[PDB]
Ligand binder design. Structure first.
Ligand SMILES: [Mg+2]
Ligand SMILES: [Mg+2]
Ligand SMILES: [Mg+2]
Ligand SMILES: [Mg+2]
Lengths: 129, 129, 129, 129
């Protein structure tokens, strides 16, 4: 895919008392950013037409710098097809002008039927990206 | 009802960078405490036998003191029936030995059918409390 | 003040398994919207120049309709000064074209010194709104 | 270390509308469980006596099964020392009687000074485990 961009602002809800973003939250921001790549309409169409859904199977996170209250960051997201069944997503939290990401995620998503068996990703949901 | 007690420990997820529990979280703790009064089995039975569910209609919160990281507090919960349709819950966050609550909530819950019409609370779900 | 507008999109993180936004989350959205009215720079200036901060003292919520996954709503926020010490905020979650709010909050905020005593809100933090 | 156990109950706050625990939440539960291994008193002592804190550097998650509303699970946690600076934590969400974990996390934590340089973990914070 191309690199998608999704802005995230850090609010009170995002920080803990150590004074930085509470680390589990980054996976939430990554999930949000993915919802802008494969939106709810696409997911609903996949479910109704094909009986398929995507699930996160693995998420490997590297936390490289603390992020403060009131920062606006850019979530950079791209994915590749890995065979018929799996999508591998690279997601990164960036600051303007930085030379490296604050947080990196490698996310593996599988395409499952209602019997929780792997099924090929249909061509139509992939087509726009 | 009687006064129910539910312990809550304050973890990193609960605080913000101002150094106290992030205020929207108290309503979560109140919801948890209510799940110990009317558990999931009772809710499921209500839904399946009667087609009814409870919804929070109003929540009035008073935040009287900040709560710090790593505190263990006691959520005190009681409710009264208000007519046929409504339950009024008093919920309070307490510290050991305090003379007043840290946080107070008055919560009004309604009993709704699938048409979102008010319906009487059945006698069976109330009986144990 | 004037009516401020803040968009909120409903993601997976926002819903529960009953199929609507989990009610404590609305107070979070209200907090976000307030951060766009009195931003972090203003708060920091208040703290450093005056030794003052704002705290939510009371929040009275009415939940009038369920909000679904993937909705985009408009948070409408306005406030009034109530004497020297207190700000009263009206916040509402709206859908496009609706005639009434999905969720209403009346929020009372106090202006406190480090001794947790009420102090007058300085003219400068109010001036732009 | 030995295997520590920490119970987690799944409440409304934990699920999303797909009907299972929202995946970023598992890292929160893992953080909680770690707070029962190295409690706030130990962390505070480390900070004040040594000027050191722990940070999560990497978290590798495998999501092997969906977890439903109202389940009670057991978080199993153990760690090993990896050289002088790093602790490697294995954390797992288990159901009673299962033969495999629902969710697995491998978490790498580093011991940092205020200059964000790696420093040896002191013997005293490790001693009880
Ligand atoms: Mg198709
Ligand atoms: Mg019955
Ligand atoms: Mg001034
Ligand atoms: Mg020492």
């Amino acid at each position: 895919s191309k690199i998608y961009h999704h802005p995230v602002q850090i609010y009170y809800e995002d920080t803990d008392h150590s004074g930085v973003v509470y680390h589990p939250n980054f996976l939430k921001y990554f999930e949000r950013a993915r919802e802008h790549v494969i939106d709810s309409d696409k997911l609903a169409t996949l479910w109704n037409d094909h009986g398929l859904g995507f699930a996160v199977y693995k998420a490997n996170m590297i936390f490289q710098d603390g992020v403060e209250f009131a920062e606006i960051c850019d979530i950079r997201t791209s994915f590749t097809l890995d065979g018929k069944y799996k999508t591998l997503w690279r997601q990164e939290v960036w600051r303007p002008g930085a030379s490296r990401a604050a947080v990196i995620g490698d996310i593996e998503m599988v395409c499952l039927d209602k019997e929780k068996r792997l099924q090929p990703v249909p061509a139509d949901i992939l087509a726009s990206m």
